């Protein structure tokens, strides 16, 4: 095996390869977002803004695993990256509400790899983890949770609340 | 002949001379809206000041063909210029539909120029075309109709809507 | 259809999607690259540096097209992405000879795209082509081209010759 | 007892003071590389800058578990430093790979630490040894993974290449 390996199990690798294949998904979700909210008939570019930055985020996420799976001397494997499950998102609060799901699915799939990381008394694996990815997670789920209750608060159905919300996020 | 003329048809000067009088005539349009919408019954100084700037634009591509008809060795033939179709325009999203539907009329009347620059060989003229009328003409559609989409939202009729999209544009 | 669509033909439309596709799937596979490069038994710094940048262009380069879609009132639909051909990519010589390979892959298809665009007569399209994908696409080809002498030269196998050269890419 | 001793288990405090012993021997011997590569029958200027600057990273490394041991309210006992395993370190490579081998040493012991820590149920001992050590442990031993597998590309045998690899040391 690798020349740097020590004390990095089968299994936190192979956890590792399938977490860097669901923030690519995440990534590509939210450039779907972001792009959508570009057309001519949706025109709300501060989501747009919000979601492209969002996009860039998980692109760089995935790239931190990567770097970890190099640095731990386990070999990266890249999977296909799944069509977002939508390619039109309705309003904004839709894609926000899309978008917390999102985010909660990528937590839980963080704290099974913080067990199996436990499990398997990697303590540099759990660091990494509470460090760079569930602290992000927990303040991203926040954060969207915040908007959700600001956007519903303007007004959540295409009129002027949207419109007046949309600025907040340019 | 011009001692400069070289492979330029009779039939694409004519019709750059009648794409002259189109972009004056455009110009004019955007000049009759711009202060429309300073009227003391009306007072949108976003839009007012969104259609002076697009008449400016108007009067320097008219300018622009008129530069590149001299570098040719076509001889430049002004015609007279046509009231506006309108002396009043309605709320703010009916001057951006009526101006969609004129860009899109330029538009066309542009893309028409190319195929007759095209059908008689001229790719110094087709390149004048889409370097500077067909790449802005297009991006001019997509933000106008970006503006209506927008205004939709917000409230498109003489309310709260168009007072704060209209602050937008200032 | 969309208010700004004119002169946009569905074929056209059509051909961006699957280009979008494309600039996402190499983007993908210089990503694996990148993080092949910066495995401890690989550690060749300058050719990860560069594959990253390329990596990073290619995703701009689908987002080009992503907003021009958007532009010409076309709608975009995003496939998956397949899983890079290789997880292991050999030598800097093999990696640069696959890179060669793929981008002149992109560079056909770039060119049946302006065919269509031809075809259809959309002046605007072929002038995208030109001016955003094709010339950087020839400029990248004869810059890999260039590489992959000077990494022949320099000693291509897995010696000091890969070691020197891979200085100048960092 | 110490009037800030709380929660600090004796196994804990006596495990200190072996790491520190440990840190204080790896100092030593990273110190006797960096001045056999000056020797002027060996001259490698930049495996020596390496080693030195190794050198005073882990006698840092040691004061920090000192400072440590106080601020818990343990008390440092230090104990003699064995001679360095060897007075001469050959080749560059063979260096790289004494001083992989140790690093892997040191952080077994590491790990073992955080055990002990764990099963006493010490999270501030643990923090520090996750925040501290471990993740500078394992930086460590990929950097001079990485350094081996450059070298070994080089040319890790006393010729042009060990010349070569040295300067990027310096
Ligand atoms: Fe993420
Ligand atoms: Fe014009
Ligand atoms: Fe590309
Ligand atoms: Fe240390
Ligand atoms: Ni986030
Ligand atoms: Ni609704
Ligand atoms: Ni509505
Ligand atoms: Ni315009
Ligand atoms: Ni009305
Ligand atoms: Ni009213
Ligand atoms: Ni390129
Ligand atoms: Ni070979
Ligand atoms: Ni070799
Ligand atoms: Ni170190
Ligand atoms: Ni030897
Ligand atoms: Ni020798």
């Given at each position: 095996?690798?020349?740097?390996?020590?004390?990095?199990?089968?299994?936190?690798?192979?956890?590792?390869?399938?977490?860097?294949?669901?923030?690519?998904?995440?990534?590509?979700?939210?450039?779907?977002?972001?792009?959508?909210f570009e057309?001519?008939?949706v025109a709300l570019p501060g989501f747009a803004k919000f979601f492209?930055?969002?996009?860039?985020?998980?692109?760089?996420?995935?790239?931190?695993?990567?770097?970890?799976?190099?640095?731990?001397?386990?070999?990266?494997?890249?999977?296909?990256?799944?069509?977002?499950?939508?390619?039109?998102?309705?309003?904004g609060?839709?894609?926000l509400?899309?978008?917390?799901?999102?985010?909660?699915?990528?937590?839980?799939?963080?704290?099974?790899?913080?067990?199996?990381?436990?499990?398997?008394?990697?303590?540099?694996?759990?660091?990494?983890?509470?460090?760079?990815?569930?602290?992000?997670?927990?303040?991203?789920?926040?954060?969207?949770?915040?908007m959700?209750?600001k956007l519903?608060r303007a007004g959540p159905?295409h009129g002027l609340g949207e419109y007046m919300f949309d600025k907040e996020l340019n």
């Open positions: 095996a690798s020349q740097v390996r020590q004390n990095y199990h089968e299994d936190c690798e192979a956890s590792i390869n399938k977490q860097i294949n669901m923030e690519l998904y995440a990534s590509y979700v939210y450039l779907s977002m972001a792009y959508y057309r001519d008939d492209k930055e969002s996009s860039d985020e998980e692109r760089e996420h995935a790239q931190t695993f990567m770097k970890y799976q190099n640095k731990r001397g386990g070999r990266i494997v890249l999977q296909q990256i799944a069509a977002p499950s939508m390619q039109e998102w309705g309003t609060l839709e894609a509400q899309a978008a917390l799901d999102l985010e909660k699915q990528v937590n839980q799939s963080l704290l099974e790899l913080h067990s199996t990381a436990s499990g398997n008394n990697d303590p540099h694996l759990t660091k990494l983890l509470e460090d760079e990815y569930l602290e992000e997670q927990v303040d991203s789920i926040k954060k969207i949770g915040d959700i209750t519903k159905h």
